Structure formats: C-alpha cells, structure tokens
Amino acid sequence: MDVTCNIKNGRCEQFCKNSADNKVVCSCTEGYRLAENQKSCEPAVPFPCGRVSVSQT
Amino acid sequence: VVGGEDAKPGQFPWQVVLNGKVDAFCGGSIVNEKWIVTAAHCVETGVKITVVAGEHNIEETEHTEQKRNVIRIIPHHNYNAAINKYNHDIALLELDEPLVLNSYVTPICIADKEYTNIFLKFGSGYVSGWGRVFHKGASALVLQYLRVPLVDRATCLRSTKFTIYNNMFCAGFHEGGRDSCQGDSGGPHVTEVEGTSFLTGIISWGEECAMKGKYGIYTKVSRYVNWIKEKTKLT
Ligand SMILES: Cc1cc2nc(CCNC(=O)c3ccc(-n4cnnc4)cc3)[nH]c2cc1C
Ligand SMILES: [Cl-]
Ligand code: NA
C-alpha cells in the first residue's frame, strides 16, 4: 500500500520525512528516541518534554 | 480561565506563573531549564520579574515550587509596544539559576515550524493559567485548564473590531462560557500528540472573556519557532 508522510503521518508518532522507495523515516523531538518498531517515540532522558509523569490518581 | 477545571498536581508541568509589581499577573511556559516563553506585553526590559515553576495552588506551599529571578528579557525583534501592544506578542525570559527538571517542572516540546503549524491544524488545544475565572472576576488560586477548539478565520475576524493577523489565531466556543481571560496572557496553548504536548500558541488577548460571540486571541508559535530555538539553545 501507499506509505507517505501525508497519509496518517507515515504512521510516525511524532515526525515523518519521505525517503526512498515508497518509505518514510520517522523521528522524534529532543529527549526522545525512535523505538525499535521504527514509528514510536520513547523517552531518552529522565524528564522528556511535554510528558505528564506525576500520577493523575 | 473561565469555564475550566482545576489542574491536578503535575498535569501541566511546563506552566509557569510570573510575579512582578503584582503577583501572578501573566503565565509562561518552560522552554528549558534556563528559559521561559511568554507574551511580550507581559514584560518590559528593566522591570523585575520572578518566575515560579512547579506551582499549583498559589496560596499553599506544596513542596514542588521553584522560584527564579529573570536576568534577561528578549521581546521578539518585531515587537513594538508603541505601535501595537499585541502584534508579535512573544518574549523570552532567561533565568538566573537553572530550574531542576522533575515531574512537576518539565519543558514543553517545541516542534519545527512545519509541524507546529500541522499540530495547530489538528484543531484542539489546551490552555492553562491563574487568570480570571469570570470576566472582571477573581483570579484563580488553583491552576485552571481548558480544551479549546480552533475557530475558523472568518468567524474570528467578524467577532472583534480589532485586527487579527495571520500570525494570530482564535479559539473558543460559539456559545462562549469557556475561554482564556485576563491574567492568563503569556501562558501556553498546547496540542497533545500521542501523549506528548507541543506548544502551538501563546495566550495573548481578548475583550469580554467568555462572552458569547467573542473568542480568545492567541499568538501562532509556528512563526517564531526558529527564533525561540536560536535564542534558548544551551549547547
Ligand atoms: C482571552 C483574554 C481576554 C482578555 N480581556 C482582557 C481585558 C480587556 N482587554 C481589551 O478589551 C483589549 C485587549 C486588546 C486590545 N487590542 C488592541 N489592539 N489589538 C488588540 C484592545 C482591548 N484581557 C484579556 C486577556 C485574555 C488572554
Ligand atoms: Cl532516534
Ligand atoms: Na503552591
């Protein structure tokens, strides 16, 4: 099927870049790492930006 | 914030409150351990500001608050209060000593220009602050938050006699009752992207808070991301 950044953000959790052969490259903001599934963003520092970490009850 | 709810501790850990001549007069957002982003009309080179991060209830010590002095104020280079107090309404505050990042004191993410604009286009963001809880009413003690939908440009224009440029956006509800208000200026408008919040706007101005037919006016952060990243870089 068609895989591009314009379709569901390339299934990237944060950022998408179009690459070669109908593929995309996902990426994340500072403090996160692209996960082994190649789409998700995992924390790479103790207190990554924009995340709620305190228990919300 | 009118029509909002009390934030739980740590729910908006990037929020700050500014204190000066009057306490809790504007909001801001943590860019990094040394830098806050706020509205330029809130600040002025020469007037002494303190920032409080990790705040929740301004009248109770909750053992998460970090107070810092401001050593440098950088209004956007196109801001000119003599011409228009609200155009290019964005400024950066440098802290004297770094914040200690933790679950209660956490930066907001800032995407590149393209993605910040995409995120605003999702159409739904969260605003937060200690501003008025009714038009011309008392200010909040406990941080308030509210989800606001993006309003179409033509509706946004027909709602006020003042000019709304393409670097500003509107948000709020057709029936009113839910809006940012005086004292929330400078605070964040954020968009949640799969559990990570990104800064999409700065709370700027309005007229009658939450009045049916009126909307809150916000600074589009996408237009200023490159300037924010350049000025606040620590490496
Ligand atoms: C949403 C909101 C509502 C507010 N009402 C006030 C008090 C009333 N302010 C006003 O009536 C007011 C605000 C801005 C302008 N203006 C001038 N040129 N462009 C815009 C003119 C008048 N402050 C607020 C702050 C906010 C953030
Ligand atoms: Cl990575
Ligand atoms: Na407190």
Side-chain angles (χ1 to χ4, degrees):
Chain A
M1 27 72 103
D2 204 14
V3 171
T4 74
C5 297
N6 282 47
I7 301 168
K8 301 177 59 59
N9 202 48
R11 288 177 171 80
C12 303
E13 181 179 325
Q14 288 179 13
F15 313 131
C16 186
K17 180 178 167 59
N18 288 305
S19 66
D21 305 302
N22 189 51
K23 302 197 173 190
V24 301
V25 167
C26 302
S27 61
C28 308
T29 195
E30 180 133 56
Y32 293 82
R33 158 181 63 81
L34 187 66
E36 202 171 334
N37 71 7
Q38 315 200 341
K39 300 302 189 181
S40 304
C41 294
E42 299 299 326
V45 298
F47 296 102
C49 70
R51 187 167 183 102
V52 174
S53 57
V54 174
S55 172
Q56 299 294 294
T57 319
Chain B
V1 179
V2 181
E5 293 164 284
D6 290 7
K8 288 170 183 166
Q11 190 177 347
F12 297 94
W14 45 85
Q15 178 79 46
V16 307
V17 63
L18 306 187
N19 298 331
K21 265 281 172 192
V22 173
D23 280 13
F25 72 88
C26 275
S29 302
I30 300 167
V31 175
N32 60 41
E33 67 201 47
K34 285 275 279 186
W35 288 96
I36 306 301
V37 63
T38 187
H41 82 260
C42 292
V43 294
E44 160 172 29
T45 48
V47 184
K48 206 205 97 294
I49 300 304
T50 63
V51 166
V52 187
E55 189 54 286
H56 177 252
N57 184 331
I58 57 152
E59 290 190 343
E60 306 188 6
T61 296
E62 294 160 292
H63 295 284
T64 58
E65 308 92 338
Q66 294 184 34
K67 300 180 168 49
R68 297 292 186 275
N69 297 307
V70 171
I71 61 162
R72 188 158 239 117
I73 299 170
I74 312 177
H76 188 264
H77 59 262
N78 295 138
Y79 187 68
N80 187 338
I83 298 163
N84 183 339
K85 177 171 181 179
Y86 305 101
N87 187 25
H88 301 299
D89 191 16
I90 192 171
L92 297 162
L93 319 175
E94 192 178 4
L95 305 182
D96 80 320
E97 294 290 342
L99 292 168
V100 167
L101 304 181
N102 63 34
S103 295
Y104 297 92
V105 177
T106 299
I108 189 62
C109 302
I110 303 180
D112 70 10
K113 173 176 175 179
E114 181 180 24
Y115 266 101
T116 298
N117 186 225
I118 289 165
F119 299 159
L120 185 67
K121 292 178 174 178
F122 287 2
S124 179
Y126 282 78
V127 297
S128 49
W130 288 268
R132 294 188 188 267
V133 302
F134 295 109
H135 177 234
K136 295 185 167 181
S139 57
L141 296 186
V142 179
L143 180 60
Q144 300 293 291
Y145 74 96
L146 174 69
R147 185 192 79 79
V148 289
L150 182 64
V151 169
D152 297 334
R153 187 177 164 280
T155 301
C156 171
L157 258 65
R158 294 166 202 280
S159 81
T160 177
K161 73 192 172 177
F162 298 104
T163 310
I164 308 304
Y165 299 123
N166 295 349
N167 55 17
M168 299 164 197
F169 66 97
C170 284
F173 292 85
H174 183 270
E175 296 306 303
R178 275 178 282 179
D179 199 359
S180 290
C181 198
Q182 189 169 58
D184 292 322
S185 300
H189 170 287
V190 307
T191 297
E192 301 182 335
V193 178
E194 305 271 27
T196 304
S197 291
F198 284 85
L199 188 67
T200 40
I202 311 299
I203 299 172
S204 190
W205 62 271
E207 289 162 274
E208 298 97 333
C209 308
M211 181 176 85
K212 180 168 181 183
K214 307 299 294 185
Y215 298 97
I217 316 300
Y218 300 79
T219 296
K220 284 184 180 169
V221 165
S222 63
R223 300 306 165 81
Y224 303 102
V225 162
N226 294 330
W227 169 85
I228 295 168
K229 297 273 188 193
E230 279 180 353
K231 299 302 192 179
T232 66
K233 196 175 193 68
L234 296 183
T235 60

